Amino acid sequence: EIDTILSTLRMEADPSLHPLFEQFEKFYEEKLWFQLSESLTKFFDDAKSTPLRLRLYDNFVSKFYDKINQLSVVKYLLASLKDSKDFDESLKYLDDLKAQFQELDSKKQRNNGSKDHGDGILLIDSEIARTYLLKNDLVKARDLLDDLEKTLDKKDSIPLRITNSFYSTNSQYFKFKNDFNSFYYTSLLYLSTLEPSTSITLAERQQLAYDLSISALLGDKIYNFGELLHHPIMETIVNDSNYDWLFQLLNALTVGDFDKFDSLIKVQISKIPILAQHESFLRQKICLMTLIETVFVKNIRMLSFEDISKATHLPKDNVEHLVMRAISLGLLKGSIDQVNELVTISWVQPRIISGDQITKMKDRLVEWNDQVEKLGKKMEARGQSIWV
Amino acid sequence: DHNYIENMNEMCKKINAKEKLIGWYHSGPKLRASDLKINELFKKYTQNNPLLLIVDVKQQGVGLPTDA
């Protein structure tokens, strides 16, 4: 009796988790499928404590893949296989269920009940790729994710859960490959799409904030840090002093204080080996940010090469390499006149601004208020004889 | 015609994929009874809250011929 067999599934269960079993019973009795989904869905959530859930799934819920949301059913294989260190077993169940949906879809049509089976399929494939990243085998990770990405971006309407899985994996992949740019972007998307039904560890969120900070520090094309310093995840790691130097570092960086940063790196540069490598980057990136700011504040935007040299403490030959590279990343637009050694700087990129940097804007705007004060108030007097 | 929709849509997606189907519009200067009924239909082909705006084609009034 899969009812009573189910009751020896209940023998090893914490009886505190038992009261749902009766539900299952009557539900297996009444076969109100939505109610079952509720029941063994939340149950199963808490029965993550129980490997039993496998056979639970593997018995009648295996019978029951016909019933409920495919996101519902697939969540089960997810949390079930989560612990599993047998990867071929995971992939096994995965392509198994897949084949079952190839059947269901083969029979059924769009408005006829097979529409978002595609969704379950996609989600599956996502976690499959995850399994590979766990399996290493890192290439089929890549091609599976990439093949998935098209199918995604053509579908306009898809549940969020899938998307959180997709960026969830891509994050990991780039994290192995150590492409920092791509990692960073994928991350921020992942976070933005994160949902309450996804409960993730505070230790995790701390970590993710850390690796994200590093990425943006070592990222070639990442020059805007306002995203993270104001991003709600940084509030998790903010208070730990073991990391306080880190905010000293980014905070120092977006306000582009050359010397102070240059002090900061001296300590931690010995500490974190990943920082030991890529010191070159950090240096370039500083020179840039410094440049950007010294332009951004300046009333009329032009520079000699000397000015940049002293501001960035860069000998002036490179100064034109520094400017040209500042443009090719999109940070600046403008031109260089060597003959006179000027830099015109058409315009400078809008970038999220912290507190202190605002104040100067307040200033310049007070000036450009005053000029108008005097001009307008000065033009009635003259030509007072002409008004209407 | 939903077949006209799901036939055209993906024929847009082949062009600029980043423009996603949102909602519909009727240029009729004021609402109709079935409006609230059919928006419920468009909830099939989009995700969040299908947006219905009304373009004023007569222009005879003042500006903002749209209303969202």
Side-chain angles (χ1 to χ4, degrees):
Chain A
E1 292 301 321
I2 191 167
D3 295 343
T4 302
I5 297 169
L6 172 60
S7 295
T8 193
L9 278 61
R10 301 177 181 178
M11 294 296 104
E12 295 180 349
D14 184 5
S16 65
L17 302 176
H18 195 282
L20 281 67
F21 292 149
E22 297 79 349
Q23 298 177 339
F24 300 162
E25 286 303 321
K26 62 192 182 75
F27 288 145
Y28 177 82
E29 294 176 353
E30 295 111 8
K31 295 175 179 179
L32 273 64
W33 298 105
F34 176 80
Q35 301 303 317
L36 279 72
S37 63
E38 297 300 322
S39 303
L40 55 88
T41 293
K42 58 194 182 71
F43 167 76
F44 185 87
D45 299 345
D46 294 346
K48 63 183 178 181
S49 174
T50 64
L52 178 290
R53 64 187 182 276
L54 285 54
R55 63 187 62 88
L56 187 299
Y57 173 84
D58 296 347
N59 294 335
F60 60 96
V61 179
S62 65
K63 290 182 176 179
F64 287 158
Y65 67 86
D66 58 356
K67 59 182 177 182
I68 57 176
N69 183 338
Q70 299 78 0
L71 279 70
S72 299
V73 305
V74 174
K75 174 59 174 174
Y76 304 140
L77 288 176
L78 264 63
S80 178
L81 295 171
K82 183 186 70 63
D83 187 7
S84 178
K85 305 301 183 179
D86 185 3
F87 296 151
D88 301 344
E89 182 180 3
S90 60
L91 296 173
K92 182 179 180 179
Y93 291 102
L94 295 172
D95 67 16
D96 298 344
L97 179 60
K98 287 184 65 65
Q100 297 179 338
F101 283 101
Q102 300 301 322
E103 181 279 331
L104 292 174
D105 298 345
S106 64
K107 288 187 171 71
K108 299 307 291 180
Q109 298 298 320
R110 291 189 296 274
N111 285 338
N112 295 342
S114 180
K115 182 171 182 290
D116 295 344
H117 285 290
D119 295 348
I121 298 166
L122 300 171
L123 172 56
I124 295 166
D125 298 348
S126 177
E127 186 64 8
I128 293 173
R130 179 180 299 281
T131 300
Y132 283 86
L133 290 180
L134 302 174
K135 186 68 179 297
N136 287 335
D137 187 0
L138 186 141
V139 179
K140 279 182 297 302
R142 181 54 176 163
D143 64 17
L144 285 174
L145 292 173
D146 297 347
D147 296 348
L148 178 63
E149 185 173 4
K150 299 173 181 177
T151 300
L152 264 62
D153 67 12
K154 286 182 292 296
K155 297 298 184 180
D156 60 10
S157 175
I158 55 101
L160 298 179
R161 177 181 294 174
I162 295 171
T163 288
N164 283 334
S165 178
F166 174 67
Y167 298 97
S168 175
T169 59
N170 287 340
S171 61
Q172 292 176 332
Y173 173 79
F174 296 151
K175 181 183 176 181
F176 294 102
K177 301 300 290 185
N178 289 337
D179 181 7
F180 296 152
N181 299 338
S182 295
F183 174 82
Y184 173 81
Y185 292 148
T186 303
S187 298
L188 292 182
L189 297 181
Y190 170 69
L191 294 180
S192 63
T193 61
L194 190 62
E195 67 186 344
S197 63
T198 52
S199 63
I200 64 174
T201 302
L202 179 65
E204 290 170 347
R205 292 173 67 92
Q206 288 173 331
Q207 187 61 54
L208 181 63
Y210 174 77
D211 294 347
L212 184 65
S213 61
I214 290 302
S215 301
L217 179 61
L218 296 173
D220 178 71
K221 58 184 66 177
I222 297 168
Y223 292 86
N224 191 343
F225 295 134
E227 289 80 357
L228 47 78
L229 291 176
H230 306 297
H231 194 274
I233 188 170
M234 301 303 291
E235 294 175 349
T236 66
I237 203 67
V238 57
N239 296 336
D240 181 2
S241 65
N242 293 335
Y243 295 139
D244 176 64
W245 60 276
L246 187 63
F247 294 177
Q248 294 299 320
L249 187 61
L250 303 183
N251 291 328
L253 170 48
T254 66
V255 298
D257 186 4
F258 179 83
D259 63 353
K260 189 171 72 67
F261 180 92
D262 180 66
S263 63
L264 269 67
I265 50 175
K266 302 298 182 292
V267 176
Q268 293 297 319
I269 198 66
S270 64
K271 304 299 183 179
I272 298 169
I274 296 170
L275 290 175
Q277 193 171 358
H278 318 297
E279 184 183 5
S280 66
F281 296 166
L282 300 175
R283 294 192 179 282
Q284 298 179 339
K285 185 177 285 288
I286 296 299
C287 297
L288 290 169
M289 295 299 295
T290 305
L291 169 65
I292 292 173
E293 298 174 354
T294 57
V295 176
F296 170 70
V297 180
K298 189 175 182 179
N299 299 340
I300 296 299
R301 290 173 180 171
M302 195 175 294
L303 289 176
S304 62
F305 295 172
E306 290 177 347
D307 292 343
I308 295 168
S309 180
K310 299 172 181 177
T312 64
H313 303 288
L314 175 64
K316 68 182 194 72
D317 58 350
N318 298 338
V319 56
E320 57 188 342
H321 299 290
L322 179 65
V323 176
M324 288 191 287
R325 184 169 179 77
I327 290 171
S328 66
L329 301 174
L331 295 181
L332 308 177
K333 288 179 183 176
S335 62
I336 297 171
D337 184 2
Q338 170 170 350
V339 173
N340 305 285
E341 299 181 354
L342 289 177
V343 183
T344 59
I345 304 302
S346 180
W347 66 263
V348 170
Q349 194 178 5
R351 185 187 72 263
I352 294 171
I353 293 300
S354 175
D356 290 345
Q357 296 173 336
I358 303 167
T359 300
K360 289 173 295 300
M361 293 181 68
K362 182 184 69 63
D363 293 344
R364 175 187 289 177
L365 187 58
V366 171
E367 297 302 321
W368 180 57
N369 186 28
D370 294 348
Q371 298 300 324
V372 182
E373 303 299 320
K374 289 188 293 186
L375 176 61
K377 186 180 64 60
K378 181 178 177 180
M379 290 175 65
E380 302 86 354
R382 302 298 298 274
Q384 182 60 59
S385 61
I386 290 179
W387 293 112
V388 173
Chain B
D1 184 1
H2 62 282
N3 293 337
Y4 182 81
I5 288 175
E6 57 190 341
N7 285 332
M8 176 70 77
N9 190 340
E10 83 291 12
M11 185 169 72
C12 294
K13 297 292 187 291
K14 292 181 177 296
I15 305 305
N16 186 341
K18 303 311 289 184
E19 294 174 350
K20 306 298 183 178
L21 173 60
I22 296 174
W24 61 285
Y25 67 94
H26 69 76
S27 62
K30 183 61 172 173
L31 303 178
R32 302 292 184 273
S34 61
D35 298 344
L36 178 63
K37 296 175 180 177
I38 60 179
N39 296 287
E40 183 278 335
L41 277 68
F42 288 91
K43 282 191 292 186
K44 188 71 181 298
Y45 301 147
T46 184
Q47 61 176 20
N48 294 335
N49 191 338
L51 182 146
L52 171 65
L53 61 80
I54 295 95
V55 176
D56 177 3
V57 68
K58 304 301 182 180
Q59 292 178 338
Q60 187 59 258
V62 192
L64 50 79
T66 59
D67 189 70

